Structure formats: C-alpha cells, structure tokens
Amino acid sequence: IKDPARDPQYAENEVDEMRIQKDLELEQYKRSSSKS
C-alpha cells in the first residue's frame, strides 16, 4: 500500500504547486538526455 491518492489529507496551494513542480522537474530530467 502506497496510498498515492492521499485521500485523508487536504491542501490548496501546497498540492497545486506540487503538481506544477512534478511536471516541470520530470520534463527537465528527460531533456537532460542522460545516457545512464
């Protein structure tokens, strides 16, 4: 069990920013085009 839903939890600005961060960081790591 990991509970990625995080249902018994709440936040407005913290979760919005986290969604933004997730997308921006994930795309940046792909662009690095590491051969590793």
Six token digits for residue 10: 């709440």
Contact letters for other proteins, residues 1-36 (x by CB under 8 A): -----------------------xx--x--xxx---
Residue whose CB is less far from other proteins, 5 or 24: 24
Q: How far is residue 13's CA from residue 6's CA, in Å, rounded to a whole number?
A: 15
| 11: phi then psi, degrees, rounded to nearest 5 | -170, 150
Cα–Cα distance, 31 to 35 (Å, whole number): 11
Q: Of the two residues 13 and 34, which places its CB atom closer to other proteins in the complex?
A: 34
Residue 1 or 24 having the CB closest to other proteins: 24
